[PDB]
Amino acid sequence: KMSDVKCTSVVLLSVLQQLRVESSSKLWAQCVQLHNDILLAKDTTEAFEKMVSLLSVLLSMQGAVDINKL
Amino acid sequence: TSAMQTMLFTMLRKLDNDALNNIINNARDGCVPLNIIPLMVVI
Amino acid sequence: DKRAKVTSAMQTMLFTMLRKLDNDALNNIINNARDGCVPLNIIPLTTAAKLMVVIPDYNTYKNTCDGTFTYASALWEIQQVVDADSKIVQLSEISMDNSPNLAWPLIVTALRA
Amino acid sequence: VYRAFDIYNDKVAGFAKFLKYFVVKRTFSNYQHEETIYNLLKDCPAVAKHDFFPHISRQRLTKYTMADLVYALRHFDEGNCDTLKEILVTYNCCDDDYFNKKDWYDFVENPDILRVYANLGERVRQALLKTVQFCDAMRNAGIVGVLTLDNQDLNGNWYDFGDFIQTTPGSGVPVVDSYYSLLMPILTLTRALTAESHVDTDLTKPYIKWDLLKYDFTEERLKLFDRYFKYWDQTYHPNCVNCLDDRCILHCANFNVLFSTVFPPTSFGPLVRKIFVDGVPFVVSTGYHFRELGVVHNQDVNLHSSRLSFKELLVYAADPAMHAASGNLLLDKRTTCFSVAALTNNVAFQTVKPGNFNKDFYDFAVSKGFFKEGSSVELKHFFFAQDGNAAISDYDYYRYNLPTMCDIRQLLFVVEVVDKYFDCYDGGCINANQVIVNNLDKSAGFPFNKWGKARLYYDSMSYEDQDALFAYTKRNVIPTITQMNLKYAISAKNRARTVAGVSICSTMTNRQFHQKLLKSIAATRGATVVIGTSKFYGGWHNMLKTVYSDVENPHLMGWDYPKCDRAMPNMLRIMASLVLARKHTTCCSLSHRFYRLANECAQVLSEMVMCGGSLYVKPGGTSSGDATTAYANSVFNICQAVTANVNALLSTDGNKIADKYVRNLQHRLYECLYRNRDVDTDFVNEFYAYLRKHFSMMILSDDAVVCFNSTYASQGLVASIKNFKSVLYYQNNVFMSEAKCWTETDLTKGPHEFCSQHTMLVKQGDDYVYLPYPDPSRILGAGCFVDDIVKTDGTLMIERFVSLAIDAYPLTKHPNQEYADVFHLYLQYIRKLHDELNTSRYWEPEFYEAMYTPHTVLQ
């Protein structure tokens, strides 16, 4: 389970950028660093923990895409 | 543009990891965090 | 056609640059040369009336833009600090403890005094 | 023990290591001769004390001479470089434990070594002064002889007066070609002329408060020349306008590069004047002060004009004078590069988005058995996103471009050999109605990209306007601006990728200058430079059998250029531009060619670059947005290879070369490098033919494969990879690691990697041919991720996938089954995509096979 978490991180940062997270320089820098560290991950649990960290900044943010309906 | 998040969550459920599924199950009913998870939860 | 458009655009840009340059400092610098011919890198250096300091970290804010600062053998006073997101960061906000809370880098805009 | 010697006699010639405080030595006649010559040169303060008692005992000298230092710095090898370390330690330039750090010798990693080497500079310049003093004695005592670096110790003193002869007083002449020429590359390395920045040339006093308005410094340049290079027997022009030939231009620029590192950097760049256009004072450039070419004053300077023409409008818009003067002052603390002016009220930030993951092809691939944990072919190529402070972190990389001075006698012959390498293409100045325009949608640089693309300006300027602008450029200097931007590209590394948009006023004339030459190099097959030769229809096989042509004991070799586009010195780029312009012997006078060289040096070498939202100064390097960078890089590559071959043929002991033709070639090479200033076309052709015979190169832009006679390179008669390492270390200020340099002994296994591709021999059509195949993981990456442009039309996605399958076809012959699985997967996917929408149907395997056979040689 390595390519799947990598494409998941790709689409996750795609969504994050789509939600204008790039308007917060610090938060966007954090997201970019986590994405680039996932795309160079050569192990699965580190990729998974960086992935849940990167998903945090998506589901901690409110006014974003809803989650109770999905 | 709303289908991007739907397919993202499809891929996320395809991953089926304990941490990710736990976080999504929590955030389902509002129990979300506030800051980035370190390597501030409410309700 | 579009040649006329680009001529008008170049003229307008040249004029918006032209009507913000001439002053006593520019002539006082140019008329002290051999035949009125100075380098280019010194017209914005000792003639300009506003400086923009791009401070990436708090240390380069201490040693450069302390609460007046002298640059280009002149006198400026730090003012109108602005972070990466273009938010007016009051000089009180820029401290040692509260530095990670504001999005670096800062942009200080100082008038010539 | 081994010591570096510069030797030239009837039996040997070269600069090589041969086996031999208060040095003691041993002929009666030679004893009396040296005694008399010393007695006549006794009072000079540059001579070391000599004791004639039978022996000739010299006193108070160092352990290593300046020859050992020049060798250690010009033949560097991190494995065996203990002499350089001992020199650095002994003279308090660093400590011993400094060499326990990793990559200390590297310039990119750990640039603090530029602070250790610099701690020799003063010492170096001291010796220089001693040199002049010494020669004065020999000009006042009537002494004729040649100055060898192995006679001056590291404290500056001299000895060993055996070669000299007694002559008439006041007329003795020293010859200092080899001495100064071998010292030249290490003058800038150690920053020898730093103490000239201080008031009375003392490193314990403040810098000269140079008048800000001062720009010429010509008198100070001549003073420095006469001070350190007094006995250099060649007319030196401080402004390279006065030269007589491009060799004079190179010769004088090589000195101006060294002399420009003592003046304030605010005095270089364009020189500006206040002219009156229809009554209003504009500020426009009426000159330029190049660090390399001195001061150039434009000839057509028109004041009190009534109205402007479109060409004049382009020269004024591209004129940074109106932009840098009428902007705000900028102190940019993010980089150490010289910052000129912020043209906006707030610094802009630029970001890069992630890749657009195509999920369809990925699920297809996983259904076709791919992406298993434990598979040999992976997904390794992604679109990396970049944050705001990325572009500037890219621009700061130009801190790897340093001022580099070259061995002028070596370069003046390497340039002849390189021109021989290009002596088969056509060239010359073409008109405006003959230029062939590629990518009419390229960026037109700042401030031209505010109103349209290059297409816009090409369709607005009539042919007469382009001709008038070319003529203008042939008499005046136009210091245009470029605009740097971040690039959306696939890579296996997360580094920022940038493209530089050069203004239209520069490319429009660089094309009229170099178009015929570039087209002639692109339309020729079988030369050393392979640019515009498609790998399709046997092209790869033909190129390989051309490199294989007649080498006797063939081996294969390759190398990389670390930080090539950033650290290429300005001297070598000027050399490359002159080699390219050498075709203009019937379309341009000498002044025309110098004004073209100055235009190019201002536009693509040390121009002003608008990064972020402001204007900074570019210290050097190549601009990827220029049409002529791919060929200037090939010229630079050929120069480096010929230089490595020269330093391999010279630095080998000519007394162990069991051949006679090779030993005579080395002797004549020394005679033609540091003697016989006039070029010897016969020996130039001889060396060119020798290289073609025993060292056959295949070179595209900063990429090279070499088939070399292994038995010669085993003895040193031909350049090896350590020679390229040494040459890149002392000429390019970059370290080349042998972890990225490959050598191949079997010619059935072709070049391990050339142009980012691999080679293997396959049996095809009852004939064994060399086929190129790419890294499969890269093609999988390019297939799974797109750049968010094909999502609106399926035709472009189908075309990208067909191109990937074309590129992927040869893996069907690879022995690894999973590799042919890649092409079969691509073919299945493209058949699907075609179902969604005989040798011309892109949905059958015989459309791709025919792309790789010379029996179907169409496009």
Numbering used by the authors:
A (entry chain C): 2 to 71
B (entry chain D): 84 to 122, 129 to 132
C (entry chain B): 78 to 144, 146 to 191
D (entry chain A): 31 to 50, 69 to 74, 76 to 102, 112 to 895, 911 to 932
Quoted from the paper:
To inform drug design, we determined the structure of nsp12, in complex with its cofactors nsp7 and nsp8, by cryo–electron microscopy (cryo-EM) using two different protocols: one in the absence of dithiothreitol (DTT) and the other in the presence of DTT. We have also observed C301 to C306 and C487 to C645 form disulfide bonds in the absence of DTT. After the collection and processing of 7994 micrograph movies, we obtained a 2.9-Å resolution three-dimensional reconstruction of an nsp12 monomer in complex with one nsp7-nsp8 pair and an nsp8 monomer, as was previously observed for SARS-CoV. The cryo-EM map allowed us to build the complete structure of COVID-19 virus nsp12, including all residues except S1 to D3 and G897 to D910. In the COVID-19 virus structure, we additionally resolved residues A4 to R118. These constitute a structural block with five antiparallel β strands and two helices. Therefore, we identify residues A4 to T28 and Y69 to R249 as the complete coronaviral NiRAN domain. With the resolution of N-terminal residues, we are also able to identify an N-terminal β hairpin (D29 to K50). The catalytic metal ions, which are observed in several structures of viral polymerases that synthesize RNA, are not observed in this work in the absence of primer-template RNA and nucleoside triphosphates (NTPs).
A key component, the RNA-dependent RNA polymerase [(RdRp), also known as nsp12], catalyzes the synthesis of viral RNA and thus plays a central role in the replication and transcription cycle of COVID-19 virus, possibly with the assistance of nsp7 and nsp8 as cofactors. Therefore, nsp12 is considered a primary target for nucleotide analog antiviral inhibitors such as remdesivir, which shows potential for the treatment of COVID-19 viral infections. The structure of the COVID-19 virus nsp12 contains a right-hand RdRp domain (residues S367 to F920) and a nidovirus-specific N-terminal extension domain (residues D60 to R249) that adopts a nidovirus RdRp-associated nucleotidyltransferase (NiRAN) architecture. The polymerase domain and NiRAN domain are connected by an interface domain (residues A250 to R365).
